[model samples]
Target: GVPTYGAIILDETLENVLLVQGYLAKSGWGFPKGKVNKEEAPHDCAAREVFEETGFDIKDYICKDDYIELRINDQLARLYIIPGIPKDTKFNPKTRREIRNIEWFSIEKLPCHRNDMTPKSKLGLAPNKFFMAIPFIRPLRDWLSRRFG
Candidate 1:
């Protein structure tokens, strides 16, 4: 699988993170990101994807060493930690075909994992709207604490 790159943009207060809503299979809110282009640098891909999805450029703020990376099923995804963006900044996607909406969600309120149906003896995690974003929540929280505290 091709690698994906993006940014976990935080508001100035660091209480919220930007998430973009996509269509169809990616119908849930998730961080702004996309698959890397051929021969493109990681940071450039992140900035390009972010700009395409959220209409806000993250190029000036990306740090070479500040990112959270995860690999699942052999596909690698990396999200640069970009803090201090003002919540009031306007964000409009470059196109509406792929993106449905852009909004900021409270970091503390977003679910880290989907709930299971233990009462019904279910075998796996229940369906959740935040499924795409859940896997990164814990790691983001940990990174925030370690970097800011």
Candidate 2:
């Protein structure tokens, strides 16, 4: 089951990144990322997951063509970049329902990390291992910077 589809929602300045913390199912902090649902295309699924998981629709955002793909938890995952997301847009996820927290991190800041237990966790940290731990992370950041930033 290669569940390959997801997106990194970037804010207007291209500095803040939206991350949602799921309640369970071995999920914690990461972008609004998940598998392409039934009868859904990869691109649509990326935005759908973002809206479903974070209560933010990325329809207005500009999506990059080049995506970052890799083996996440042994499942092939495709991570896309949704750039220029409107900032402070009343982000309201499923509070106490499925998600625990929602935060906007600074991409302009350092992307650092120290652990490797849950490779997804690193995306939430700084000085990442984003490049080494996750193929899509670094490329997405660069793609955003090169194309839009």
lDDT (Cα, tens digit) per residue for candidate 1, span 37-81: 999999999999999999999999999999999998999999999
Q: Which portions of model 2 show Cα errors greater than 4 Å? A: 25-27, 60-66, 110-136
Inter-residue clash pairs, candidate 2:
111-126, 111-127, 111-128, 112-126, 112-127, 112-128, 113-126
lDDT of 1: 0.96
TM-score for all models, in order of appearance: 0.98, 0.71
* lDDT, candidates in the order shown: 0.96, 0.66
1-149 in candidate 2: lDDT tens per residue?
A: 74857677777777877777765453556666776778988778877777777778766663556566777578887767766667867778654587777778776553434444455654443443233324444666667678765
Q: After superposition, how far is residue 68 of candidate 2 from its true place, in Å?
A: 2.4
